[PDB]
């Protein structure tokens, strides 16, 4: 659900070693960060490995590979997290494609619950 709102418009900004952008969770309530089981990120069609990913929720920045220790860190309903991607080369100006594929470990649901979205974003300075 809410797939069309996963990648937030106008949120792509350069940071040292990569780019950041805004992401919303495709689920109808808050969920502990530890149950965001998979999050496949693509920039310009290239997959960004999990070791190069961070999620910022409110005032908390966590490496994506350590989310298991965030059992009580809530991705609140509709809260925008800032995802930071370390990239192997600097990004030029203009528009770029950002893809996100979610898998949620939902306890009352037997298989990972899925939502997916992709948008073309311009690099805002």
């Amino acid at each position: 659900m809410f797939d069309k709102y996963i990648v937030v418009e106008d949120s792509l900004k350069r940071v040292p070693g990569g780019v950041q952008f805004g992401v919303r969770l495709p689920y109808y309530r808050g969920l502990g960060l530890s149950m965001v089981e998979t999050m496949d990120v693509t920039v310009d069609g290239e997959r960004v490995p999990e070791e190069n990913l961070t999620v910022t929720l409110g005032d908390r920045t966590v490496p994506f590979a350590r989310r298991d220790d965030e059992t009580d860190t809530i991705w609140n309903f509709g809260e925008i997290a800032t995802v930071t991607a370390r990239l192997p080369h600097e990004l030029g100006p203009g528009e770029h494609q950002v893809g996100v594929n979610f898998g949620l470990r939902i306890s009352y649901f037997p298989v990972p619950m899925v939502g997916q979205d992709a948008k073309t974003l311009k690099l805002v300075d």
Partner: protein, 324 residues
């Protein structure tokens, strides 16, 4: 004349997600329709739960008085798969459930919607804590379950032996899915389904043909991947016997008036409201019918969402069927 109208704030998720409606906006919308009973999802529109302070809860109480609304029901969740590689232990689960009992006690609710998948054994262990707050625990019955499903049958076994009036049920109207929901079929075709096969699937749904036959038959007729997923929804939407409710009236604490689409004629397009509501009248039901709009996730890909309008129509329809 004792059936009361309420709304689950789950109905406004699209506007709340987009920050188009606040939490108070949601209660406000509700009173304007005469739906004074509120069912709410703490993990959805009260960030900071379960660490809400007395200022929040006292503030919620003051809001209820301003709108004349009544806080009826809290919808709990249980994230048993919170820890990777394991499920919560029984002691950890009681802790999660008691959070919800406390919060529901502090919110002024009289009943909790207990998730359908919660085990009979877990219901038994938190019961003494429920007793301490004079708090009812109502197991949601939603598709593909029904009041005769062995999982519910086993729950009834436990409640019969324990004998507590605080243990009961919340029927969800998806067990009275008379037709394959139109908005589901229409989204399916937008996703690439073969329209003639959607029509076959919708046709077989009305015929009550076994889900597994329809799946293999759609497979057999050359369905693409989207058609197959469409057919398998027949395992997740079911019809059930509306008169079966008369047997359980003492345990029906609250009802999920689920709906997906109210047309311009104020008629719900796939669910059996016209059959279920007379039975509740026949049975002496004095609880709430709580609007639970879920159409948003199906229509949002091609249409703007109007949860407020949709609930207005659902509430007008409920009022008519009750006789007010």
């Amino acid at each position: 004349p004792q059936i009361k109208r309420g709304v689950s704030l789950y109905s406004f998720q699209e506007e709340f997600f987009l920050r188009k409606m606040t939490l108070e906006d949601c209660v406000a919308a509700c009173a304007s329709m005469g739906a004074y009973g509120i069912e709410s999802l703490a993990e959805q529109m009260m960030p900071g739960f379960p660490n809400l302070d007395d200022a929040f809860y006292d503030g919620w109480h003051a809001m209820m008085a301003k709108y004349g609304t009544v806080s009826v029901c809290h919808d709990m969740f249980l994230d048993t798969k919170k820890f990777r590689g394991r499920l919560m232990t029984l002691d950890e689960q009681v802790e999660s459930f008691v959070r919800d009992i406390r919060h529901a006690s502090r919110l002024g609710c009289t009943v909790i919607r207990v998730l359908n998948f919660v085990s009979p054994e877990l219901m038994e262990k938190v019961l003494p804590h429920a007793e301490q707050s004079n708090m009812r625990l109502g197991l949601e019955i939603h598709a593909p379950m029904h009041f005769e499903h062995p999982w519910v049958l086993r729950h009834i076994e436990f409640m019969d032996r324990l004998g507590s009036p605080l243990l009961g049920f919340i029927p969800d109207m998806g067990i009275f899915t008379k037709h394959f929901p139109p908005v589901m079929a229409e989204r399916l075709i937008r996703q690439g389904a073969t329209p003639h096969i959607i029509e076959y699937i919708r046709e077989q749904y009305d015929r009550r043909v076994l889900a597994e036959y329809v799946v293999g038959d759609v497979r057999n007729m050359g369905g693409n991947p989207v058609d197959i997923r469409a057919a398998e929804m027949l395992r997740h939407n079911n019809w059930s016997n509306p008169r079966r409710l008369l047997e359980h009236m003492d345990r029906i604490f609250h009802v999920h008036a689920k709906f997906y689409e109210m047309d311009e004629q104020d008629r719900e397009t796939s669910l059996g409201y016209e059959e279920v509501i007379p039975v509740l009248k026949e049975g002496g039901y004095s609880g709430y019918l709580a609007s639970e709009y879920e159409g948003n996730r199906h229509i949002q890909d091609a249409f703007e969402v109007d949860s407020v309008e949709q609930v207005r129509r659902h509430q007008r329809m409920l009022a008519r069927l009750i006789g007010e």
